[PDB]
């Protein structure tokens, strides 16, 4: 219930080329996350990294190439850990691997906060259905298990019968899209989900974007806010160490602004930071700078500012 702050590592992925994403929490932990947050006068509670062990064959090969049942089922264990953390009065930060963890953290939140809304910052809409993308895409496919209007087009995969769609199409706003499949594009249109693509930001501005965003979410009533920030939303020059880097994305300035704005509502309840994959960096510098950016996002969302803060009454 966002009075203090919980840090939860959830190193989940499906393996294959994007398996260094499971190493993201350490990378961010190693960007000095907790210092910052501690030094932002936050009471912190570090809930550690979750067990991610494949079902039902934990032999080598499955670890390198994981099955969907294994993720869906690790999200169940996540929703539970998110749920209890909210229940004890904490704001959830979940350091991620692949954007699929959003399934467990939104499901967890919804549970003790059923009026919540979502800001999905991302180059992708991650809103494919199981029948619209490959076995591999579950990271780019998690929003069709949460939205409540898609269940007519969404089948029962084993590991996923616990998920109970906890969002209507009018509770999620997208910021930063530039890489959207036709299946996704039609869904956005057809079910009247509002979104601000890189085009709408060129036109409107990050200032007017956030203005329009809040009106559509918290405009006629206060709700708890769930920021699912995906790192590939930042232009790749800023965030190179990620699996699907798409060019033309947020500047550093745009991204902090978004965080700055979310904090300034003082309604933020849970935050997801995902797709940080150090195996994909050109150097240690590139891995480090990506995680440094990811520590800034969180810091901002939890009160960091570019112009000062805190307390002083200075001496002579």
């Amino acid at each position: 219930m966002v009075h203090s702050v919980a840090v939860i590592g959830a190193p989940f992925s499906q393996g294959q080329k994007r398996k260094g994403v499971e190493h993201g929490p350490a990378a961010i932990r190693e960007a000095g996350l907790m210092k910052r947050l501690s030094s932002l006068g936050c009471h912190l509670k570090d809930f550690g990294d979750l067990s991610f062990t494949p079902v039902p064959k934990d032999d080598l090969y499955n670890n390198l190439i994981v099955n969907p049942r294994s993720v869906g089922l690790a999200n169940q264990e996540l929703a539970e850990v998110v749920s209890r953390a909210v229940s004890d009065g904490y704001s959830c930060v979940t350091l991620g691997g692949d954007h699929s963890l959003a399934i467990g953290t939104i499901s967890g939140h919804a549970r003790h906060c059923p009026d919540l809304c979502v800001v999905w910052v991302d180059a992708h809409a991650d809103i494919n259905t199981p029948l619209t993308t490959s076995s591999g895409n579950l990271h780019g496919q998690p929003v069709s298990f949460l939205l409540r209007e898609l269940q007519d087009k969404v089948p029962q995969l084993p590991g996923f019968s616990w998920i109970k769609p906890c969002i209507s199409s009018a509770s999620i706003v997208y910021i930063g899209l530039r890489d959207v499949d036709p299946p996704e594009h039609f869904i956005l249109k057809n079910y009247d989900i509002q979104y601000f693509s890189m085009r709408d930001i060129d036109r409107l501005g990050i200032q007017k974007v956030m203005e329009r965003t809040f009106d559509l979410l918290i405009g006629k009533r206060q709700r708890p806010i769930h920021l699912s920030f995906d790192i590939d939303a930042f232009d790749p020059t800023l965030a190179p160490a990620t699996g699907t880097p798409v060019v033309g994305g947020l500047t550093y300035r745009e991204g902090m602004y978004i965080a700055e704005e979310i904090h300034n509502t003082g309604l933020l309840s849970a935050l997801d930071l995902v797709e940080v994959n150090p195996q994909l960096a050109t150097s240690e510098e590139e891995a480090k700078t990506t995680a440094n950016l990811a520590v800034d996002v969180i810091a901002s969302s939890f009160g960091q500012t570019r112009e000062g803060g805190h307390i002083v009454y200075d001496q002579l």
């Epitope: 190493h23 390198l64 150090p278 195996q279 891995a287």
Partner: antibody, heavy 118, light 109 residues
Framework: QLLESGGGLVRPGGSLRLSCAAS????????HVWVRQAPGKGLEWVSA????????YYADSVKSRFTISRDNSKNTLYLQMNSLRAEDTAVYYC?????????????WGRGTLVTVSS | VLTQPPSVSAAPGQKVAVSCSGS????????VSWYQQLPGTAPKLLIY???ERTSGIPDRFSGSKSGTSATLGITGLQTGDEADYYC???????????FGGGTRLTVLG
Amino acid sequence: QLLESGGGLVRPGGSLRLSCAASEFTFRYDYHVWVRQAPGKGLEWVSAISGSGGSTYYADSVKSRFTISRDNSKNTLYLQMNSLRAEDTAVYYCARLRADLGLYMDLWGRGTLVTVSS
Amino acid sequence: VLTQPPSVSAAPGQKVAVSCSGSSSNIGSHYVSWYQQLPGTAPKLLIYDNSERTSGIPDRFSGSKSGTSATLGITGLQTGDEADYYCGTWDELTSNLVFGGGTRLTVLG
């Protein structure tokens, strides 16, 4: 590059300890294995370890005698060999293990000789 | 556990196919890599996911899988090609990576 060492002549019943020094900073994020080649026979995968050393896997051929370890701080993989026999006599090779549609070993070392003769 | 025939022959400029036979639990079910053992050197990766070349390897090399078997085509045979070629994949009955015994290709120039 991968570069193995600390092979040598050891007497049956003997122990020995290999190192593999990797160059990549991405070494710590990636499974590595150990494959040995008995002199002019084929390749036999011996052991494999996870990026963090939470998970080790061993071949029936070498299980419980051999122990795979790594120190990411030193960008080094190790193999501790105990209870060594003639039939362990082989060139031992570190390798990086990665996934895509299936599994392939994309980075390898020069090798190191273990002779186990009475 | 994988069977590939032991030897192969040709003069520079010609072509061969090294065959790899396995089963249900591996090739029938998993992807196959191809590794070139230059004599007196550690092997090098040529092909993963049945036919995916790695950088700088020319298109002379081609891999192919069908049910329970796989095959490495090599055309326009050259000196410095002659070496030991091994197939590799994962067997889901024993839970390991397996290789073929190897094939020695000598180029008679």
